[PDB]
Design a protein around this ligand. Sequence first.
Ligand SMILES: *[C@@H]1O[C@H](CO)[C@@H](O[C@@H]2O[C@H](CO)[C@@H](O)[C@H](O)[C@H]2NC(C)=O)[C@H](O)[C@H]1NC(C)=O
Ligand SMILES: *[C@@H]1O[C@H](CO)[C@@H](O[C@@H]2O[C@H](CO)[C@@H](O)[C@H](O)[C@H]2NC(C)=O)[C@H](O)[C@H]1NC(C)=O
Ligand SMILES: *[C@@H]1O[C@H](CO)[C@@H](O[C@@H]2O[C@H](CO)[C@@H](O)[C@H](O)[C@H]2NC(C)=O)[C@H](O)[C@H]1NC(C)=O
Ligand SMILES: *[C@@H]1O[C@H](CO)[C@@H](O)[C@H](O)[C@H]1NC(C)=O
Ligand SMILES: *[C@@H]1O[C@H](CO)[C@@H](O)[C@H](O)[C@H]1NC(C)=O
Ligand SMILES: *[C@@H]1O[C@H](CO)[C@@H](O)[C@H](O)[C@H]1NC(C)=O
Ligand SMILES: *[C@@H]1O[C@H](CO)[C@@H](O)[C@H](O)[C@H]1NC(C)=O
Ligand SMILES: *[C@@H]1O[C@H](CO)[C@@H](O)[C@H](O)[C@H]1NC(C)=O
Ligand SMILES: *[C@@H]1O[C@H](CO)[C@@H](O)[C@H](O)[C@H]1NC(C)=O
Lengths: 95, 164, 323, 216
Amino acid sequence: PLSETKCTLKSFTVEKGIYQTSNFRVQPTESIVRFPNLCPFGEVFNATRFASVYAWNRKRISNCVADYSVLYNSASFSTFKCYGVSPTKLNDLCF
Amino acid sequence: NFNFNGLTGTGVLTESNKKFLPFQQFGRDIADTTDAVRDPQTLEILDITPCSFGGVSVITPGTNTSNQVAVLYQDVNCTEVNVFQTRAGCLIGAEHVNNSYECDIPIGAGICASYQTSQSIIAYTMSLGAENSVAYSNNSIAIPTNFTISVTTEILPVSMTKTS
Amino acid sequence: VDCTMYICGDSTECSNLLLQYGSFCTQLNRALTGIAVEQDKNTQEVFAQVKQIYKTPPIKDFGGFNFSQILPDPSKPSKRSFIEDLLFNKVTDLICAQKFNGLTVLPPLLTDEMIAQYTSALLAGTITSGWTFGAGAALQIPFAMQMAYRFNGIGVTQNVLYENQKLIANQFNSAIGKIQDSLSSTASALGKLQDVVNQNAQALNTLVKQLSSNFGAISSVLNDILSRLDKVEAEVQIDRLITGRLQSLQTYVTQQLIRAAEIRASANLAATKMSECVLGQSKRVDFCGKGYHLMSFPQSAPHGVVFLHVTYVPAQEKNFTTA
Amino acid sequence: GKIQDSLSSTASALGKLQDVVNQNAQALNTLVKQLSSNFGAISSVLNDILSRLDKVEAEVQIDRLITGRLQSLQTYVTQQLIRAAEIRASANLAATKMSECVLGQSKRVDFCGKGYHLMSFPQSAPHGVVFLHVTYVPAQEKNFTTAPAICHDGKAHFPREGVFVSNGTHWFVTQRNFYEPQIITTDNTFVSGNCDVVIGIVNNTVYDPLQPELDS
Ligand SMILES: *[C@@H]1O[C@H](CO)[C@@H](O[C@@H]2O[C@H](CO)[C@@H](O)[C@H](O)[C@H]2NC(C)=O)[C@H](O)[C@H]1NC(C)=O
Ligand SMILES: *[C@@H]1O[C@H](CO)[C@@H](O[C@@H]2O[C@H](CO)[C@@H](O)[C@H](O)[C@H]2NC(C)=O)[C@H](O)[C@H]1NC(C)=O
Ligand SMILES: *[C@@H]1O[C@H](CO)[C@@H](O[C@@H]2O[C@H](CO)[C@@H](O)[C@H](O)[C@H]2NC(C)=O)[C@H](O)[C@H]1NC(C)=O
Ligand SMILES: *[C@@H]1O[C@H](CO)[C@@H](O)[C@H](O)[C@H]1NC(C)=O
Ligand SMILES: *[C@@H]1O[C@H](CO)[C@@H](O)[C@H](O)[C@H]1NC(C)=O
Ligand SMILES: *[C@@H]1O[C@H](CO)[C@@H](O)[C@H](O)[C@H]1NC(C)=O
Ligand SMILES: *[C@@H]1O[C@H](CO)[C@@H](O)[C@H](O)[C@H]1NC(C)=O
Ligand SMILES: *[C@@H]1O[C@H](CO)[C@@H](O)[C@H](O)[C@H]1NC(C)=O
Ligand SMILES: *[C@@H]1O[C@H](CO)[C@@H](O)[C@H](O)[C@H]1NC(C)=O
């Protein structure tokens, strides 16, 4: 913690008096996830009958868990894009 | 580093006496920053708080005198770090002194450090001034019999380097 | 303020970008430290002009003037004159909220208890030693024989006081009393102090609330703004946060610099009064407050100072033909 | 002679000046270093962005250079303005001291430095001024019994200037800031009131210049 002062002072002779050098941020020991199914992607993505665009089908989905892995492991999909979504953090995301 | 029902945050979770309304979720503060939370699996009111933070401060006599330094951790409690606890934070490497001398290297809240006694950086409550008590009585006057003429340099800026 | 943290919370991703703005982060600390340093220089210049700490004698006989109001209270744990407590109650969470994001409140070098020892000394020497303690070693002089001079200062021959002493005693004391209620019954007298404290806590709130603004970025949470966004596109987003926030500091910093420069001017005004008015007797008309000035009594107040100016105001007139 | 010894080894007494010169070159330095910063653009060299890319892209990048540098000026400039006023107030104080202290004699207390002020001698210094304040400081004190007044015949006698003192027997009136005792005569003292009112008046005899002059 002394040598940092010489870098902040920018002088091999640090004259008398107190110098602010660095900051310490206590890092956290471990994570607490304190929550108080499966999501039908085999029923949506392997579904047998999609309607057209004039009467498109909409399925509100909640209260289940995301299988976001095999989405990327599918790799038979032509155009697959995401805006504001990260693949690594997709599992981490809690919609 | 906590996540409560999708709420994420990093703090010091403690017991707390503040009492929610039942339907509520987050307590908050004037800054809208998350303050208190309710543990979902068993309802209890947990505070939150910053980590130790503060700035590091290296108290040193001139490198001409010593290479020894006393580190002041500002505004922390001495755990997360010869140690001494101050008003201004956690000080390390300066031996406390019950004696009180002139403030020399100002630290905070009256704590002032100086190098002298072998030697070690010390830390002590600064004495403001030396003490005197005027000897006073309603008939008592003290008239100077002799004087000095002192020349005291006083120095002021006038102009600064002009630029364009 | 911690520039790297306040801008980039807990993210190296953002933290690396900040390096591309160079010395902004450092020069802000260099700026605020310049303020923070001279603040304890202000308080240094004002309060401690006196070489030694004088203390009042054990027994108070001033000729009828009652200073128990203004002198340190021996029965308080922190010894502060009865009046000063009225002040510390008027002036006044923000305790850790600011301290979340790297907004720190450093302790003033001089504790309030120390400030009350200076303003005891200055007030102890003023009473016993007259004005001479500012010019050198304090000289005990009978207080009633002090006020004979301070009349000669304003042109009233001293034979007025030696004859009117008892009267002047009561007028003084009864004047001190009303100073209590003047403070006690109205909270707007301290507005000057109260405004300073508010404006500081004001901008801090504003500075904090700037963390929650989008600044054109998709969100104000740096995690969602940087981690959710592609390590390619999220760069441009975090700029709008950084550029926004980093600017928002310079706004705050510049305000403090300007505002401190006002206080720096007000501090000298105090240090001028403290030297001329308290330590000496002022010949400057209405510099010490309306009327011919006799003496002044400093009193500390939070991040401020309060003077009690004892002044001489004539009253009853009689038309006279003159030549 | 003490002054010249102080300066001979004192780097600090000029700290006020040395700081001002520093802080400018400081912000001047920092102003320069800001020419080396990316500011988000792909490089901090102006041309090296150009010759790398076709200009319709450079028009975008050079923003983040200009937006950066232009800001860094307004930071530096707004600094100087603030810092200028700081010198500005100091310059006003110097004019006040130059005017009052040197060209006058300042009745103001501790404006010209501790002690009663006699005169000041200005001395130039780089980007500044240095006053040598010659001040009159009393030294040796002697505890004296005093009285605010002296009865004579029942009239009260007060000093014109100074105070009645005694070393314990003979009452002397003396000037205040120096001990110069003198026997008490009407030329020292004026008559006001009588012996009842004054608090602390003592019993004494104020010698008369005139009475002996008669006796022949
Ligand atoms: C100075 O004034 C204070 C109050 O302003 C006096 O203290 C009071 O003393 C009387 C005794 O007759 C008590 O009944 C009161 O309760 C006291 N009040 C307080 C607030 O302490 C004090 O006696 C006065 N002293 C002089 C020398 O004038
Ligand atoms: C106080 O000062 C007076 C003034 O000098 C002293 O009176 C003189 O004392 C000396 C003693 O050496 C005698 O020789 C003179 O004749 C005295 N003159 C007068 C006019 O009295 C006095 O003695 C001093 N007293 C004390 C206690 O210091
Ligand atoms: C000064 O002298 C006067 C007399 O000229 C003193 O006044 C009287 O003092 C005696 C005691 O010695 C009392 O018994 C009398 O009652 C006093 N006068 C009256 C009318 O009451 C005085 O005490 C002496 N001392 C001073 C005042 O300094
Ligand atoms: C400072 O150190 C130098 C050697 O680097 C020495 O010559 C000089 O005497 C020292 N001065 C003080 C005040 O310590
Ligand atoms: C430090 O922690 C101890 C207990 O852990 C507590 O008694 C003390 O008050 C704390 N001090 C500060 C300044 O937090
Ligand atoms: C000061 O004295 C107390 C006892 O009153 C003692 O506990 C403490 O250790 C002393 N401080 C130092 C630095 O020795
Ligand atoms: C002096 O005379 C004027 C005449 O108008 C009057 O106003 C004033 O009150 C008089 N002074 C006193 C003390 O009565
Ligand atoms: C005056 O009396 C006080 C009484 O304590 C003493 O301390 C002081 O030294 C005396 N003055 C001189 C010049 O000795
Ligand atoms: C001065 O104070 C003393 C108390 O020590 C007292 O006896 C004396 O009467 C007082 N004299 C005056 C004039 O106040």
